[PDB]
């Protein structure tokens, strides 16, 4: 299973003219490109090592796609402004994301595409990829404009043929990395809270992909975690980190196990401290 997703963001700026436009591309949990109409070089540019051996032909085209999207989105922000009867003074956000996913066979499993205005679902592309559906009541005129114009087809073509095709080329270019599973380095830390209790915190460091799951269990096992769990976070070197903590009665530490589940480990590791 692999995916190729892009995230597009356009933010209006009443004062400073043209709204900011940003695009980032990912292959699974690895960002490989980006575009920013506000940086030194508007260009789609490389953001992963395995993308520095590409020619002008590639960068010019993607740059063209990013720039065209930006211009349309400029127009769309004025349009969306008219729909919510919002004044020209405030700043607003138009978001667009699209992606294709492969199944194990390595072939097209599914595709997706949706727009959002000011952080809310606006227009979504149907599961079969053959028509649109307004998710926000205010997006209904866009749904018809779009279905009548038959715009889903060009998106479906892209999601099934182009996206998938390139997802394959990308995995091949960055195989050394992209296909390698990096399991987590693990351990449980002990942090006394008082003379009665103490927090048991299980660590998972430097793993990839991001998906992982840590589960505390002690043991007359009614339920039951009540665990403090932080959002899986990026180490900054391409890998991820996470931990799950609980409060144990002092002396009762050892009755606790932390189960670590991830793709890169031949099977789940169990931690006790």
């Amino acid at each position: 299973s692999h995916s190729l997703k892009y995230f597009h963001t356009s933010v209006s700026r009443p004062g400073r003219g043209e709204p900011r436009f940003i695009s980032v591309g990912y292959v699974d949990d690895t960002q490989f490109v980006r575009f920013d109409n506000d940086a030194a070089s508007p260009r789609m540019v490389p953001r992963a090592p395995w993308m520095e051996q590409e020619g002008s032909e590639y960068w010019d085209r993607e740059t063209r796609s990013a720039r065209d999207t930006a211009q349309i989105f400029r127009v769309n922000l004025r349009t969306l402004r008219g729909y919510y009867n919002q004044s020209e003074a405030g700043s607003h956000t138009l978001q667009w994301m699209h992606g294709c996913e492969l199944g194990p066979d390595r072939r097209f499993l599914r595709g997706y595409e949706q727009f959002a205005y000011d952080g809310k679902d606006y227009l979504t592309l149907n599961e079969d990829l053959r028509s649109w559906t307004a998710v926000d009541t205010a997006a209904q005129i866009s749904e018809q404009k779009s279905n009548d114009a038959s715009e889903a087809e060009h998106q479906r073509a892209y999601l099934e043929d182009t996206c998938v095709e390139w997802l394959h080329k990308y995995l091949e270019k960055g195989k050394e990395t992209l296909l390698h599973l990096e399991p987590p380095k693990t351990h449980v830390t002990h942090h006394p809270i008082s003379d009665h209790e103490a927090t048991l915190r299980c660590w998972a460091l430097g793993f990839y992909p991001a998906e992982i799951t840590l589960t505390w269990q002690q043991d007359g096992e009614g339920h039951t975690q009540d665990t403090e769990l932080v959002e899986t976070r990026p180490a900054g070197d391409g890998t991820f980190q996470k931990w799950a903590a609980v409060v144990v009665p002092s002396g009762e530490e050892q009755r606790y196990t932390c189960h670590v589940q991830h793709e890169g480990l031949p099977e789940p590791v169990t931690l006790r401290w």
Partner: peptide, 9 residues
């Protein structure tokens, strides 16, 4: 590559 076409909302 990214979608070469988008929607005019």
């Amino acid at each position: 590559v990214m979608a070469p076409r988008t929607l005019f909302l």
